[PDB]
């Protein structure tokens, strides 16, 4: 078995052209500066990323090693510098894989290269699978019984900020606003002309409602919007159990599909009237009790 495990690693080297010498790195690459920003902070302070500190140490220790090697120095002193240089590079690539980490200020471990690539908060699981999005909104939900199955109430102020590009384009075309900047000013002030234009543009344009845990695919469902005063999304009481939404207090996010293909999908695939039956067992879900 020892030979079996050992064979796995060593065979990979022979078949591949790449030589084993990549284990021992001679030159340390550096991250581009925008990816480790020394951003100015309001109030005259500064904000720096931890990679700068770790890169600073390896540069410092390498520089001193050149000085020690240049003049005649003993073996004890040069060995300690080579030992510290090796430790510094280790901290940069993976802080905490050997002994105590480089705490810096003492309150907290310094971040590291691999630390960005790991865990729930890592790049993979926080910025590549799931991102934040524009043209999106949020509000508490209330029950509206007079709605139809394919309808949801959208607050006036909420819808206005979602559909701001579309309102501006129509305002110019309908000549209520002269130019693009003048159209921008009109919607931000919230003049009376905007509300008439707004109801014209939202029609036949679905919006994707969504509740936070979203266990199963009926968590996201498109709806035909409809303006309503107040500040709470009206929702249809039949579709509550698909979202698992009660009305204690439950904020529901609102997304907007933009392109022609995307909004077509919300009308055909994701509509709330073509999702009567649970996909688990083909049982009705839109008749709560």
């Amino acid at each position: 078995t020892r030979a079996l495990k050992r064979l796995k690693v060593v065979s990979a080297f022979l078949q591949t052209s790449n030589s084993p010498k990549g284990m021992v790195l001679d030159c340390v690459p550096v991250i581009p500066p925008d990816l480790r920003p020394m951003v100015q902070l309001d109030g005259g302070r500064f904000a720096t990323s931890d990679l700068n500190d770790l890169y600073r140490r390896v540069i410092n220790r390498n520089n001193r090693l050149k000085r020690l090697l240049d003049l005649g120095a003993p073996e004890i002193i040069v060995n300690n510098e080579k030992r510290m240089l090796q430790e510094a590079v280790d901290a940069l690539f993976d802080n905490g894989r050997r002994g105590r980490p480089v705490t810096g200020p003492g309150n907290r471990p310094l971040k590291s290269l691999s630390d960005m690539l790991k865990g729930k908060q890592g790049r993979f699981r926080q910025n590549l699978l799931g991102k934040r999005v524009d043209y999106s909104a949020r509000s508490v939900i209330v029950v509206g019984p007079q709605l139809k199955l394919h309808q949801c109430g959208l607050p006036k102020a909420m819808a206005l900020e979602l559909f701001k590009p579309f309102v501006m384009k129509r305002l110019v075309d309908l000549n209520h606003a002269q130019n693009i900047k003048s159209a921008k000013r009109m919607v931000e002030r919230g003049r009376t002309v905007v509300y008439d234009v707004l109801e014209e543009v939202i029609a036949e344009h679905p919006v994707l409602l969504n509740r936070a845990p979203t266990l199963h695919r009926l968590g996201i469902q498109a709806f035909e919007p409809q303006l309503v005063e107040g500040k709470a999304i009206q929702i249809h009481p039949l579709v509550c159990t698909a979202f698992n939404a009660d009305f204690d207090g439950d904020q529901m996010a609102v997304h907007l599909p933009l392109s022609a293909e995307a909004q077509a999908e919300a009308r055909i695939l994701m509509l709330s009237s073509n999702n009567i039956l649970k996909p688990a067992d083909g049982r009705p879900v839109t008749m709560p009790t």
Binding site: K278, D281, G282
Partner: protein
């Protein structure tokens, strides 16, 4: 009422919430109430983890063929626990044998009742139990021989639409979510050790 760490008290609650509990009765009841709130938060965490791991292994299962080439199926019991002189259907026939398409026909009197490549429904299952056949061989996802993913016939009809599954549907993601959704609803443990 369950005492802490899954024990029972010898002195149960004798009063109803209408009649109003006593002081000591209220204190013992809290042991189970707080434990349920803490445990429920944990079951959501574990159910979420189970769904996430399931999705990875269950992806790459996509419907990418109208019909498989093969004949291998799976034999399922349509009807069992038949008392003497009568036929009794299986208790779990809905979740097991419904919405599947027969690998091969079924003959009991020498004549086909339900021909092959016909999905089963209420009407067809009724035909088979009335004539008295006790098992059936339905094609299924296990025995699919598709070089890429799974064919539509072996998956059988979907359930959210009541028709044959479309080409390109992600059956894999659907299956993972279905197993993980009622995970919070489970919340079962031995009443007392």
């Amino acid at each position: 009422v369950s005492n802490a760490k899954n024990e029972t008290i010898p002195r149960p609650i004798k009063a109803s919430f209408r009649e109003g509990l006593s002081v000591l009765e209220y204190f013992i009841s809290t042991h189970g109430a707080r434990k349920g709130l803490a445990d429920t938060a944990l079951r959501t965490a574990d159910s979420g983890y189970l769904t996430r791991r399931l999705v990875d292994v269950s992806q790459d299962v996509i419907i990418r063929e109208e019909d498989c080439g093969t004949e291998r199926g799976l034999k399922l019991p349509i009807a069992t626990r038949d008392a003497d002189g009568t036929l009794r259907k299986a208790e779990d026939v809905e979740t097991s044998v419904y919405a599947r398409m027969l690998a091969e026909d079924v003959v009991i009197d020498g004549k086909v009742i339900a021909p092959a490549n016909v999905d089963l429904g209420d009407v067809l299952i009724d035909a088979l139990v009335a004539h008295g056949v006790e098992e059936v061989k339905t094609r299924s996802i296990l025995t699919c021989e598709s070089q890429v993913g799974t064919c539509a016939m072996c998956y059988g009809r979907s359930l959210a639409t009541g028709k044959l599954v479309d080409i390109g549907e992600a059956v894999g993601i659907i299956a993972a979510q279905s197993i993980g959704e009622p995970g919070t609803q489970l919340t079962m443990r031995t009443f007392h050790t």
